[PDB]
């Protein structure tokens, strides 16, 4: 899959910063809280708009591809949520896992 990807697309992000941050009139959705994973739909539509806005010459083209593979991975993880039907006692365990976690390690406004 996609371990290799991210680490590389990070430094790619780093080196193409000044170029990306040059349209100062442009505004993109950015969540106001830090449960990033609730927000992938937005995070990805911002990249889309960024991408349509930025000139497709150079190694920059590669940064976007990479982001699109990460997009694919995430889409797949998401389809795995509702893939496999199971007995109720199973689903309850999940729920309580989900609730413990929502409790020990999310900020809560």
């Amino acid at each position: 899959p996609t371990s290799a990807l991210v680490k590389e697309t990070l430094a790619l992000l780093s080196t193409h910063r000044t170029l990306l941050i040059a349209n100062e009139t442009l505004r993109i959705p950015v969540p106001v809280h830090k449960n990033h994973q609730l927000c992938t739909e937005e995070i990805f539509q911002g990249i889309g708009t960024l991408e349509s806005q930025t000139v497709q010459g150079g190694t920059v083209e590669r940064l976007f591809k990479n982001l699109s593979l990460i997009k694919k991975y995430i889409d797949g993880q998401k389809k795995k949520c509702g893939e496999e039907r199971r007995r109720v006692n199973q689903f309850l365990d999940y729920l309580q896992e989900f609730l413990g976690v929502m409790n020990t390690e999310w900020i809560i406004e």
Partner: protein, 307 residues
Amino acid sequence: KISLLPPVNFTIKVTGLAQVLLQWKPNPDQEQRNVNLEYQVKINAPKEDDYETRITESKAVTILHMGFSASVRTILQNDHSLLASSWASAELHAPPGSPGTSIVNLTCTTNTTEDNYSRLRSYQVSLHCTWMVGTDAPEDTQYFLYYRYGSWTEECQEYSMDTLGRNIACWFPRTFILSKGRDWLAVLVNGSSKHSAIRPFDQLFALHAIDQINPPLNVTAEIEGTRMSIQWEKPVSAFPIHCFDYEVKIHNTRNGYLQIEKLMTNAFISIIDDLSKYDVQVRAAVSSMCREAGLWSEWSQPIYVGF
């Protein structure tokens, strides 16, 4: 042809350490809503920003001891046109107090340790701040430190005083600060005295900038004929194994010869000579790949191999 009017009842209110809430209300006299209006917010001081928002409220994390000032304006975008109104404005004044009454040089430092109980591996975060008293502070003045992380605010319990009363340091062996945390730490230092008001002072720290990473433990070197096997363990921290950068430093005490290797694994095999005592140390930092660049740890204690 629509004619946009500024929002009204624009107010700023302090809701916690280095935190505020901007609110306003749509303009009662606006050409009736069948179109969705939005807002543009511009923070003017101490630190510039603007951004657009779609509801009528906005949180802002910001330093307050310098006073804060903001403006907001209404906008309407569509097919063929942008339109934006005149601005409303508001501000908080800087808190009362003489200039040198205020704390100076505040530094803060985080460090992680392991709860050696609880049957389940979680971790603990301490915080340690120092500052100096500032030149105009009256002799009787006392300083107090508060911190905030996400929704939790605490006041300091155990200080360290200068040789005539005044708090100059603070220590929390535990806190509500998440280790792998990605949010701001906010620190406030108040004061008081018989002979006048004291200027508060606050600041925002990023965790990666102040987290004192722990050295690797258990560095072992096995010398075998001509090869040296060095080995070490992941530092005490809540970032997993694959999140660390190391530097391993091999130093020949016989002639000075020096070798340093940067790497992300936990072991290293270096060619060596058989007539020297070497000392070897290891240093650690968390990978820019897991969090933004932060601090290096101290080097582990020298261990020695060879004769």
